[PDB]
Amino acid sequence: VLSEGEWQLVLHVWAKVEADVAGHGQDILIRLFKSHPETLEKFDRFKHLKTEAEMKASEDLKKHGVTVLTALGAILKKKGHHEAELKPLAQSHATKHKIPIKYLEFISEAIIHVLHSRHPGDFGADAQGAMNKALELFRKDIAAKYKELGY
Ligand code: HEM
Numbered sequence: 001v002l003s004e005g006e007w008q009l010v011l012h013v014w015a016k017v018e019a020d021v022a023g024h025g026q027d028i029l030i031r032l033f034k035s036h037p038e039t040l041e042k043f044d045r046f047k048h049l050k051t052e053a054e055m056k057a058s059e060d061l062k063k064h065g066v067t068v069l070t071a072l073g074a075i076l077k078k079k080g081h082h083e084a085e086l087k088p089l090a091q092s093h094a095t096k097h098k099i100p101i102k103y104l105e106f107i108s109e110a111i112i113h114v115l116h117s118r119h120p121g122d123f124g125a126d127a128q129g130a131m132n133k134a135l136e137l138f139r140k141d142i143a144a145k146y147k148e149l150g151y
Helices: 004-035 052-057 059-077 083-096 101-118 125-149
Strands: none
Touching (some): 004 059, 004 125
């Protein structure tokens, strides 16, 4: 489990993200889609986007970026007790969206990359390690529910 100190590092940089949820959301999804094209195919709404420029110009994509980061933010603030927030997400992503745990690892990588680019001063090695731990916890817990459902 994460220590109190680790959670503080996570929430300190996350407070910076919430200052511009929409901007971060775009960068993260675009990074995810460009680095792992198979993830873009999971979105009927975004399949038509064939270039980074098209992705950046999509208001709909920007809208989803906010939805994603807002859900993640709520989870992170619950620290070591995010059971309630995780249940709905795990269910929909396992049964409706069909998102393998591997894709969650991909988006975790996208999140860390963007945080480094936008907040280097509050995202040094210690903070980076802490965020990695928090995102690993997120994945592990979702994985547990996936195994439960048999996905
Ligand atoms: C940080 C990790 C993620 C969070 C917090 C997150 C959160 C959400 C939320 C809140 C919704 C809308 C409500 C719902 O359907 O449950 C959603 C929808 C969706 N997510 Fe995620 N998601 C994450 C990662 C992913 C990944 C990695 C993929 C695909 C590779 C994905 C694919 C989808 C799809 C396809 C939908 C449905 C979109 C629609 O029909 O409009 N999500 N996600």
